Amino acid sequence: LNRFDRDRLFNVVARGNPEDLAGLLEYLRRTSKYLTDSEYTEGSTGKTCLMKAVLNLQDGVN
């Protein structure tokens, strides 16, 4: 797994499609990355992909 962009990750979770997350774990393991690293946050507030997932809810759940 070569790359997973923050922009793509936020877009994936907003749409709420769990299948589009495929490869994220492998990419993180290969690169030893964490979803809380500056790369996966806006920087201006420190907003995570989990916050986005909760901000974008289809009725009750995501």
mmCIF file of the N, C-alpha and C atoms, coordinates in Angstrom:
data_MODEL
# 
_entry.id   MODEL 
# 
loop_
_atom_site.group_PDB 
_atom_site.id 
_atom_site.type_symbol 
_atom_site.label_atom_id 
_atom_site.label_alt_id 
_atom_site.label_comp_id 
_atom_site.label_asym_id 
_atom_site.label_entity_id 
_atom_site.label_seq_id 
_atom_site.pdbx_PDB_ins_code 
_atom_site.Cartn_x 
_atom_site.Cartn_y 
_atom_site.Cartn_z 
_atom_site.occupancy 
_atom_site.B_iso_or_equiv 
_atom_site.pdbx_formal_charge 
_atom_site.auth_seq_id 
_atom_site.auth_comp_id 
_atom_site.auth_asym_id 
_atom_site.auth_atom_id 
_atom_site.pdbx_PDB_model_num 
ATOM 1   N N  . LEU A 1 1  ? 0.820   -1.208 0.000  1.00 0.00 ? 1  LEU A N  1 
ATOM 2   C CA . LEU A 1 1  ? 0.000   0.000  0.000  1.00 0.00 ? 1  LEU A CA 1 
ATOM 3   C C  . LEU A 1 1  ? 0.858   1.264  0.000  1.00 0.00 ? 1  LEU A C  1 
ATOM 4   N N  . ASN A 1 2  ? 0.753   2.057  -1.071 1.00 0.00 ? 2  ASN A N  1 
ATOM 5   C CA . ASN A 1 2  ? 1.662   3.184  -1.266 1.00 0.00 ? 2  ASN A CA 1 
ATOM 6   C C  . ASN A 1 2  ? 1.205   4.433  -0.517 1.00 0.00 ? 2  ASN A C  1 
ATOM 7   N N  . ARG A 1 3  ? -0.091  4.749  -0.549 1.00 0.00 ? 3  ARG A N  1 
ATOM 8   C CA . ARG A 1 3  ? -0.554  5.997  0.048  1.00 0.00 ? 3  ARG A CA 1 
ATOM 9   C C  . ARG A 1 3  ? -2.029  5.906  0.413  1.00 0.00 ? 3  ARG A C  1 
ATOM 10  N N  . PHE A 1 4  ? -2.397  6.731  1.393  1.00 0.00 ? 4  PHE A N  1 
ATOM 11  C CA . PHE A 1 4  ? -3.777  6.994  1.799  1.00 0.00 ? 4  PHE A CA 1 
ATOM 12  C C  . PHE A 1 4  ? -3.790  8.465  2.190  1.00 0.00 ? 4  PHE A C  1 
ATOM 13  N N  . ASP A 1 5  ? -4.488  9.308  1.437  1.00 0.00 ? 5  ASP A N  1 
ATOM 14  C CA . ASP A 1 5  ? -4.465  10.732 1.741  1.00 0.00 ? 5  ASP A CA 1 
ATOM 15  C C  . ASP A 1 5  ? -5.498  11.090 2.800  1.00 0.00 ? 5  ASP A C  1 
ATOM 16  N N  . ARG A 1 6  ? -5.172  12.120 3.585  1.00 0.00 ? 6  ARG A N  1 
ATOM 17  C CA . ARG A 1 6  ? -6.131  12.655 4.543  1.00 0.00 ? 6  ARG A CA 1 
ATOM 18  C C  . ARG A 1 6  ? -7.399  13.097 3.831  1.00 0.00 ? 6  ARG A C  1 
ATOM 19  N N  . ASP A 1 7  ? -7.241  13.819 2.718  1.00 0.00 ? 7  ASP A N  1 
ATOM 20  C CA . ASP A 1 7  ? -8.391  14.255 1.938  1.00 0.00 ? 7  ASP A CA 1 
ATOM 21  C C  . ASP A 1 7  ? -9.280  13.081 1.562  1.00 0.00 ? 7  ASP A C  1 
ATOM 22  N N  . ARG A 1 8  ? -8.683  11.971 1.124  1.00 0.00 ? 8  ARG A N  1 
ATOM 23  C CA . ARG A 1 8  ? -9.500  10.817 0.767  1.00 0.00 ? 8  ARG A CA 1 
ATOM 24  C C  . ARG A 1 8  ? -10.158 10.213 1.999  1.00 0.00 ? 8  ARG A C  1 
ATOM 25  N N  . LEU A 1 9  ? -9.427  10.143 3.113  1.00 0.00 ? 9  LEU A N  1 
ATOM 26  C CA . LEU A 1 9  ? -9.965  9.511  4.313  1.00 0.00 ? 9  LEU A CA 1 
ATOM 27  C C  . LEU A 1 9  ? -11.193 10.260 4.809  1.00 0.00 ? 9  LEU A C  1 
ATOM 28  N N  . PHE A 1 10 ? -11.090 11.585 4.910  1.00 0.00 ? 10 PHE A N  1 
ATOM 29  C CA . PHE A 1 10 ? -12.237 12.389 5.310  1.00 0.00 ? 10 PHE A CA 1 
ATOM 30  C C  . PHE A 1 10 ? -13.407 12.182 4.354  1.00 0.00 ? 10 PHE A C  1 
ATOM 31  N N  . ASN A 1 11 ? -13.139 12.162 3.045  1.00 0.00 ? 11 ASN A N  1 
ATOM 32  C CA . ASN A 1 11 ? -14.209 11.941 2.077  1.00 0.00 ? 11 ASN A CA 1 
ATOM 33  C C  . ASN A 1 11 ? -14.849 10.572 2.267  1.00 0.00 ? 11 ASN A C  1 
ATOM 34  N N  . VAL A 1 12 ? -14.037 9.553  2.554  1.00 0.00 ? 12 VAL A N  1 
ATOM 35  C CA . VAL A 1 12 ? -14.564 8.202  2.734  1.00 0.00 ? 12 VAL A CA 1 
ATOM 36  C C  . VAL A 1 12 ? -15.532 8.162  3.908  1.00 0.00 ? 12 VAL A C  1 
ATOM 37  N N  . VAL A 1 13 ? -15.092 8.663  5.064  1.00 0.00 ? 13 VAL A N  1 
ATOM 38  C CA . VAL A 1 13 ? -15.903 8.598  6.276  1.00 0.00 ? 13 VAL A CA 1 
ATOM 39  C C  . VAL A 1 13 ? -17.133 9.495  6.173  1.00 0.00 ? 13 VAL A C  1 
ATOM 40  N N  . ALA A 1 14 ? -17.023 10.644 5.500  1.00 0.00 ? 14 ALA A N  1 
ATOM 41  C CA . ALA A 1 14 ? -18.200 11.486 5.325  1.00 0.00 ? 14 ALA A CA 1 
ATOM 42  C C  . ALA A 1 14 ? -19.302 10.721 4.603  1.00 0.00 ? 14 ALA A C  1 
ATOM 43  N N  . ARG A 1 15 ? -18.976 10.136 3.446  1.00 0.00 ? 15 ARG A N  1 
ATOM 44  C CA . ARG A 1 15 ? -19.931 9.298  2.728  1.00 0.00 ? 15 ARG A CA 1 
ATOM 45  C C  . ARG A 1 15 ? -20.417 8.124  3.568  1.00 0.00 ? 15 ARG A C  1 
ATOM 46  N N  . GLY A 1 16 ? -19.657 7.713  4.580  1.00 0.00 ? 16 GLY A N  1 
ATOM 47  C CA . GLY A 1 16 ? -20.091 6.614  5.420  1.00 0.00 ? 16 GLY A CA 1 
ATOM 48  C C  . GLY A 1 16 ? -20.002 5.245  4.785  1.00 0.00 ? 16 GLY A C  1 
ATOM 49  N N  . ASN A 1 17 ? -19.100 5.059  3.819  1.00 0.00 ? 17 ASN A N  1 
ATOM 50  C CA . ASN A 1 17 ? -18.930 3.762  3.179  1.00 0.00 ? 17 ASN A CA 1 
ATOM 51  C C  . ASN A 1 17 ? -17.752 3.037  3.809  1.00 0.00 ? 17 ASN A C  1 
ATOM 52  N N  . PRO A 1 18 ? -17.980 2.017  4.644  1.00 0.00 ? 18 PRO A N  1 
ATOM 53  C CA . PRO A 1 18 ? -16.846 1.369  5.319  1.00 0.00 ? 18 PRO A CA 1 
ATOM 54  C C  . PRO A 1 18 ? -15.923 0.643  4.364  1.00 0.00 ? 18 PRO A C  1 
ATOM 55  N N  . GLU A 1 19 ? -16.440 0.180  3.227  1.00 0.00 ? 19 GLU A N  1 
ATOM 56  C CA . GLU A 1 19 ? -15.628 -0.584 2.289  1.00 0.00 ? 19 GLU A CA 1 
ATOM 57  C C  . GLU A 1 19 ? -14.538 0.268  1.647  1.00 0.00 ? 19 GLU A C  1 
ATOM 58  N N  . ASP A 1 20 ? -14.772 1.573  1.484  1.00 0.00 ? 20 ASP A N  1 
ATOM 59  C CA . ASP A 1 20 ? -13.757 2.445  0.901  1.00 0.00 ? 20 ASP A CA 1 
ATOM 60  C C  . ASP A 1 20 ? -12.560 2.656  1.821  1.00 0.00 ? 20 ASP A C  1 
ATOM 61  N N  . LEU A 1 21 ? -12.642 2.236  3.084  1.00 0.00 ? 21 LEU A N  1 
ATOM 62  C CA . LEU A 1 21 ? -11.496 2.317  3.980  1.00 0.00 ? 21 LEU A CA 1 
ATOM 63  C C  . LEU A 1 21 ? -10.456 1.246  3.697  1.00 0.00 ? 21 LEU A C  1 
ATOM 64  N N  . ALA A 1 22 ? -10.761 0.290  2.821  1.00 0.00 ? 22 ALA A N  1 
ATOM 65  C CA . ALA A 1 22 ? -9.863  -0.828 2.569  1.00 0.00 ? 22 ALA A CA 1 
ATOM 66  C C  . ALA A 1 22 ? -8.451  -0.343 2.279  1.00 0.00 ? 22 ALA A C  1 
ATOM 67  N N  . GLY A 1 23 ? -7.479  -0.979 2.933  1.00 0.00 ? 23 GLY A N  1 
ATOM 68  C CA . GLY A 1 23 ? -6.081  -0.658 2.760  1.00 0.00 ? 23 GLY A CA 1 
ATOM 69  C C  . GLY A 1 23 ? -5.519  0.292  3.797  1.00 0.00 ? 23 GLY A C  1 
ATOM 70  N N  . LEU A 1 24 ? -6.372  0.967  4.569  1.00 0.00 ? 24 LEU A N  1 
ATOM 71  C CA . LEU A 1 24 ? -5.871  1.953  5.518  1.00 0.00 ? 24 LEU A CA 1 
ATOM 72  C C  . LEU A 1 24 ? -4.983  1.295  6.567  1.00 0.00 ? 24 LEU A C  1 
ATOM 73  N N  . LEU A 1 25 ? -5.455  0.197  7.162  1.00 0.00 ? 25 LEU A N  1 
ATOM 74  C CA . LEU A 1 25 ? -4.655  -0.512 8.157  1.00 0.00 ? 25 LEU A CA 1 
ATOM 75  C C  . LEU A 1 25 ? -3.303  -0.912 7.581  1.00 0.00 ? 25 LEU A C  1 
ATOM 76  N N  . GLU A 1 26 ? -3.311  -1.565 6.416  1.00 0.00 ? 26 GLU A N  1 
ATOM 77  C CA . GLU A 1 26 ? -2.060  -1.988 5.798  1.00 0.00 ? 26 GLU A CA 1 
ATOM 78  C C  . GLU A 1 26 ? -1.144  -0.799 5.553  1.00 0.00 ? 26 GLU A C  1 
ATOM 79  N N  . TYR A 1 27 ? -1.687  0.300  5.030  1.00 0.00 ? 27 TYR A N  1 
ATOM 80  C CA . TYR A 1 27 ? -0.849  1.472  4.810  1.00 0.00 ? 27 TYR A CA 1 
ATOM 81  C C  . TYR A 1 27 ? -0.236  1.957  6.117  1.00 0.00 ? 27 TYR A C  1 
ATOM 82  N N  . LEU A 1 28 ? -1.033  2.009  7.187  1.00 0.00 ? 28 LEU A N  1 
ATOM 83  C CA . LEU A 1 28 ? -0.517  2.474  8.470  1.00 0.00 ? 28 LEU A CA 1 
ATOM 84  C C  . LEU A 1 28 ? 0.559   1.538  9.011  1.00 0.00 ? 28 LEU A C  1 
ATOM 85  N N  . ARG A 1 29 ? 0.330   0.223  8.923  1.00 0.00 ? 29 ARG A N  1 
ATOM 86  C CA . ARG A 1 29 ? 1.334   -0.738 9.372  1.00 0.00 ? 29 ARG A CA 1 
ATOM 87  C C  . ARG A 1 29 ? 2.626   -0.596 8.577  1.00 0.00 ? 29 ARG A C  1 
ATOM 88  N N  . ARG A 1 30 ? 2.519   -0.550 7.247  1.00 0.00 ? 30 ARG A N  1 
ATOM 89  C CA . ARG A 1 30 ? 3.711   -0.421 6.415  1.00 0.00 ? 30 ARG A CA 1 
ATOM 90  C C  . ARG A 1 30 ? 4.490   0.840  6.761  1.00 0.00 ? 30 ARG A C  1 
ATOM 91  N N  . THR A 1 31 ? 3.789   1.948  6.994  1.00 0.00 ? 31 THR A N  1 
ATOM 92  C CA . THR A 1 31 ? 4.436   3.226  7.259  1.00 0.00 ? 31 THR A CA 1 
ATOM 93  C C  . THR A 1 31 ? 4.610   3.521  8.743  1.00 0.00 ? 31 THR A C  1 
ATOM 94  N N  . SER A 1 32 ? 4.037   2.704  9.627  1.00 0.00 ? 32 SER A N  1 
ATOM 95  C CA . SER A 1 32 ? 4.073   2.974  11.063 1.00 0.00 ? 32 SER A CA 1 
ATOM 96  C C  . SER A 1 32 ? 3.464   4.344  11.358 1.00 0.00 ? 32 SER A C  1 
ATOM 97  N N  . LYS A 1 33 ? 2.263   4.563  10.830 1.00 0.00 ? 33 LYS A N  1 
ATOM 98  C CA . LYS A 1 33 ? 1.543   5.815  10.984 1.00 0.00 ? 33 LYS A CA 1 
ATOM 99  C C  . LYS A 1 33 ? 0.351   5.631  11.912 1.00 0.00 ? 33 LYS A C  1 
ATOM 100 N N  . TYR A 1 34 ? -0.092  6.748  12.486 1.00 0.00 ? 34 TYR A N  1 
ATOM 101 C CA . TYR A 1 34 ? -1.262  6.774  13.347 1.00 0.00 ? 34 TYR A CA 1 
ATOM 102 C C  . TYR A 1 34 ? -2.255  7.818  12.860 1.00 0.00 ? 34 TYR A C  1 
ATOM 103 N N  . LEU A 1 35 ? -3.539  7.499  13.028 1.00 0.00 ? 35 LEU A N  1 
ATOM 104 C CA . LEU A 1 35 ? -4.611  8.380  12.589 1.00 0.00 ? 35 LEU A CA 1 
ATOM 105 C C  . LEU A 1 35 ? -4.669  9.685  13.368 1.00 0.00 ? 35 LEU A C  1 
ATOM 106 N N  . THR A 1 36 ? -3.856  9.840  14.409 1.00 0.00 ? 36 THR A N  1 
ATOM 107 C CA . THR A 1 36 ? -3.806  11.071 15.181 1.00 0.00 ? 36 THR A CA 1 
ATOM 108 C C  . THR A 1 36 ? -2.619  11.941 14.809 1.00 0.00 ? 36 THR A C  1 
ATOM 109 N N  . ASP A 1 37 ? -1.822  11.521 13.830 1.00 0.00 ? 37 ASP A N  1 
ATOM 110 C CA . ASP A 1 37 ? -0.652  12.281 13.425 1.00 0.00 ? 37 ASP A CA 1 
ATOM 111 C C  . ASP A 1 37 ? -1.077  13.503 12.622 1.00 0.00 ? 37 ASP A C  1 
ATOM 112 N N  . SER A 1 38 ? -0.251  14.548 12.679 1.00 0.00 ? 38 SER A N  1 
ATOM 113 C CA . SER A 1 38 ? -0.543  15.803 11.992 1.00 0.00 ? 38 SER A CA 1 
ATOM 114 C C  . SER A 1 38 ? -1.034  15.568 10.567 1.00 0.00 ? 38 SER A C  1 
ATOM 115 N N  . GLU A 1 39 ? -0.507  14.534 9.901  1.00 0.00 ? 39 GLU A N  1 
ATOM 116 C CA . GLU A 1 39 ? -0.915  14.249 8.529  1.00 0.00 ? 39 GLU A CA 1 
ATOM 117 C C  . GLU A 1 39 ? -2.415  14.007 8.427  1.00 0.00 ? 39 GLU A C  1 
ATOM 118 N N  . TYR A 1 40 ? -3.009  13.383 9.444  1.00 0.00 ? 40 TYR A N  1 
ATOM 119 C CA . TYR A 1 40 ? -4.421  13.023 9.415  1.00 0.00 ? 40 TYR A CA 1 
ATOM 120 C C  . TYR A 1 40 ? -5.295  13.971 10.232 1.00 0.00 ? 40 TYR A C  1 
ATOM 121 N N  . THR A 1 41 ? -4.833  15.196 10.458 1.00 0.00 ? 41 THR A N  1 
ATOM 122 C CA . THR A 1 41 ? -5.603  16.224 11.138 1.00 0.00 ? 41 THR A CA 1 
ATOM 123 C C  . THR A 1 41 ? -5.460  17.530 10.370 1.00 0.00 ? 41 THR A C  1 
ATOM 124 N N  . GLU A 1 42 ? -6.429  18.427 10.564 1.00 0.00 ? 42 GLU A N  1 
ATOM 125 C CA . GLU A 1 42 ? -6.410  19.690 9.834  1.00 0.00 ? 42 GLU A CA 1 
ATOM 126 C C  . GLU A 1 42 ? -5.237  20.575 10.233 1.00 0.00 ? 42 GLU A C  1 
ATOM 127 N N  . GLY A 1 43 ? -4.749  20.469 11.464 1.00 0.00 ? 43 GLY A N  1 
ATOM 128 C CA . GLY A 1 43 ? -3.676  21.340 11.918 1.00 0.00 ? 43 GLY A CA 1 
ATOM 129 C C  . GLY A 1 43 ? -4.146  22.630 12.552 1.00 0.00 ? 43 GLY A C  1 
ATOM 130 N N  . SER A 1 44 ? -5.185  23.244 11.988 1.00 0.00 ? 44 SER A N  1 
ATOM 131 C CA . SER A 1 44 ? -5.663  24.512 12.519 1.00 0.00 ? 44 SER A CA 1 
ATOM 132 C C  . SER A 1 44 ? -6.514  24.297 13.762 1.00 0.00 ? 44 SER A C  1 
ATOM 133 N N  . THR A 1 45 ? -7.124  23.119 13.897 1.00 0.00 ? 45 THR A N  1 
ATOM 134 C CA . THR A 1 45 ? -7.932  22.817 15.066 1.00 0.00 ? 45 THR A CA 1 
ATOM 135 C C  . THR A 1 45 ? -7.474  21.496 15.671 1.00 0.00 ? 45 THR A C  1 
ATOM 136 N N  . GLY A 1 46 ? -6.942  20.609 14.832 1.00 0.00 ? 46 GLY A N  1 
ATOM 137 C CA . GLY A 1 46 ? -6.620  19.263 15.269 1.00 0.00 ? 46 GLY A CA 1 
ATOM 138 C C  . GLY A 1 46 ? -7.812  18.343 15.128 1.00 0.00 ? 46 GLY A C  1 
ATOM 139 N N  . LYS A 1 47 ? -8.460  18.373 13.967 1.00 0.00 ? 47 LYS A N  1 
ATOM 140 C CA . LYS A 1 47 ? -9.689  17.622 13.753 1.00 0.00 ? 47 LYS A CA 1 
ATOM 141 C C  . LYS A 1 47 ? -9.358  16.274 13.129 1.00 0.00 ? 47 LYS A C  1 
ATOM 142 N N  . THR A 1 48 ? -9.850  15.202 13.745 1.00 0.00 ? 48 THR A N  1 
ATOM 143 C CA . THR A 1 48 ? -9.536  13.843 13.327 1.00 0.00 ? 48 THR A CA 1 
ATOM 144 C C  . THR A 1 48 ? -10.604 13.280 12.395 1.00 0.00 ? 48 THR A C  1 
ATOM 145 N N  . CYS A 1 49 ? -10.249 12.177 11.733 1.00 0.00 ? 49 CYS A N  1 
ATOM 146 C CA . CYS A 1 49 ? -11.194 11.492 10.857 1.00 0.00 ? 49 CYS A CA 1 
ATOM 147 C C  . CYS A 1 49 ? -12.386 10.941 11.627 1.00 0.00 ? 49 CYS A C  1 
ATOM 148 N N  . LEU A 1 50 ? -12.218 10.660 12.921 1.00 0.00 ? 50 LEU A N  1 
ATOM 149 C CA . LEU A 1 50 ? -13.343 10.179 13.717 1.00 0.00 ? 50 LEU A CA 1 
ATOM 150 C C  . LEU A 1 50 ? -14.359 11.287 13.953 1.00 0.00 ? 50 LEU A C  1 
ATOM 151 N N  . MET A 1 51 ? -13.887 12.492 14.273 1.00 0.00 ? 51 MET A N  1 
ATOM 152 C CA . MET A 1 51 ? -14.789 13.629 14.412 1.00 0.00 ? 51 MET A CA 1 
ATOM 153 C C  . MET A 1 51 ? -15.596 13.837 13.136 1.00 0.00 ? 51 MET A C  1 
ATOM 154 N N  . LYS A 1 52 ? -14.926 13.815 11.983 1.00 0.00 ? 52 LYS A N  1 
ATOM 155 C CA . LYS A 1 52 ? -15.631 13.932 10.711 1.00 0.00 ? 52 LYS A CA 1 
ATOM 156 C C  . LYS A 1 52 ? -16.711 12.863 10.580 1.00 0.00 ? 52 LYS A C  1 
ATOM 157 N N  . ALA A 1 53 ? -16.383 11.616 10.923 1.00 0.00 ? 53 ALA A N  1 
ATOM 158 C CA . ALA A 1 53 ? -17.365 10.541 10.817 1.00 0.00 ? 53 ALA A CA 1 
ATOM 159 C C  . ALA A 1 53 ? -18.587 10.828 11.676 1.00 0.00 ? 53 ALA A C  1 
ATOM 160 N N  . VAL A 1 54 ? -18.381 11.394 12.865 1.00 0.00 ? 54 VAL A N  1 
ATOM 161 C CA . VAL A 1 54 ? -19.512 11.709 13.730 1.00 0.00 ? 54 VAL A CA 1 
ATOM 162 C C  . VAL A 1 54 ? -20.227 12.959 13.235 1.00 0.00 ? 54 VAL A C  1 
ATOM 163 N N  . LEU A 1 55 ? -19.497 13.916 12.661 1.00 0.00 ? 55 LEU A N  1 
ATOM 164 C CA . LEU A 1 55 ? -20.155 15.095 12.111 1.00 0.00 ? 55 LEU A CA 1 
ATOM 165 C C  . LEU A 1 55 ? -21.028 14.735 10.916 1.00 0.00 ? 55 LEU A C  1 
ATOM 166 N N  . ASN A 1 56 ? -20.665 13.690 10.177 1.00 0.00 ? 56 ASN A N  1 
ATOM 167 C CA . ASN A 1 56 ? -21.432 13.215 9.027  1.00 0.00 ? 56 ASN A CA 1 
ATOM 168 C C  . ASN A 1 56 ? -22.099 11.895 9.416  1.00 0.00 ? 56 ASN A C  1 
ATOM 169 N N  . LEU A 1 57 ? -23.321 11.986 9.926  1.00 0.00 ? 57 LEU A N  1 
ATOM 170 C CA . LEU A 1 57 ? -24.103 10.826 10.332 1.00 0.00 ? 57 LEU A CA 1 
ATOM 171 C C  . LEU A 1 57 ? -25.317 10.687 9.428  1.00 0.00 ? 57 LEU A C  1 
ATOM 172 N N  . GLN A 1 58 ? -25.577 9.466  8.971  1.00 0.00 ? 58 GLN A N  1 
ATOM 173 C CA . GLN A 1 58 ? -26.775 9.178  8.186  1.00 0.00 ? 58 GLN A CA 1 
ATOM 174 C C  . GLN A 1 58 ? -27.814 8.690  9.184  1.00 0.00 ? 58 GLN A C  1 
ATOM 175 N N  . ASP A 1 59 ? -28.710 9.592  9.579  1.00 0.00 ? 59 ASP A N  1 
ATOM 176 C CA . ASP A 1 59 ? -29.713 9.334  10.613 1.00 0.00 ? 59 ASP A CA 1 
ATOM 177 C C  . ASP A 1 59 ? -28.962 9.044  11.909 1.00 0.00 ? 59 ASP A C  1 
ATOM 178 N N  . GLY A 1 60 ? -29.054 7.847  12.491 1.00 0.00 ? 60 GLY A N  1 
ATOM 179 C CA . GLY A 1 60 ? -28.420 7.622  13.777 1.00 0.00 ? 60 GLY A CA 1 
ATOM 180 C C  . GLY A 1 60 ? -26.941 7.281  13.811 1.00 0.00 ? 60 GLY A C  1 
ATOM 181 N N  . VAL A 1 61 ? -26.431 6.549  12.821 1.00 0.00 ? 61 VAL A N  1 
ATOM 182 C CA . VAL A 1 61 ? -25.089 5.983  12.895 1.00 0.00 ? 61 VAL A CA 1 
ATOM 183 C C  . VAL A 1 61 ? -24.324 6.256  11.606 1.00 0.00 ? 61 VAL A C  1 
ATOM 184 N N  . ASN A 1 62 ? -23.028 5.956  11.662 1.00 0.00 ? 62 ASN A N  1 
ATOM 185 C CA . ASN A 1 62 ? -22.120 6.000  10.525 1.00 0.00 ? 62 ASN A CA 1 
ATOM 186 C C  . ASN A 1 62 ? -21.333 4.699  10.528 1.00 0.00 ? 62 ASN A C  1 
# 
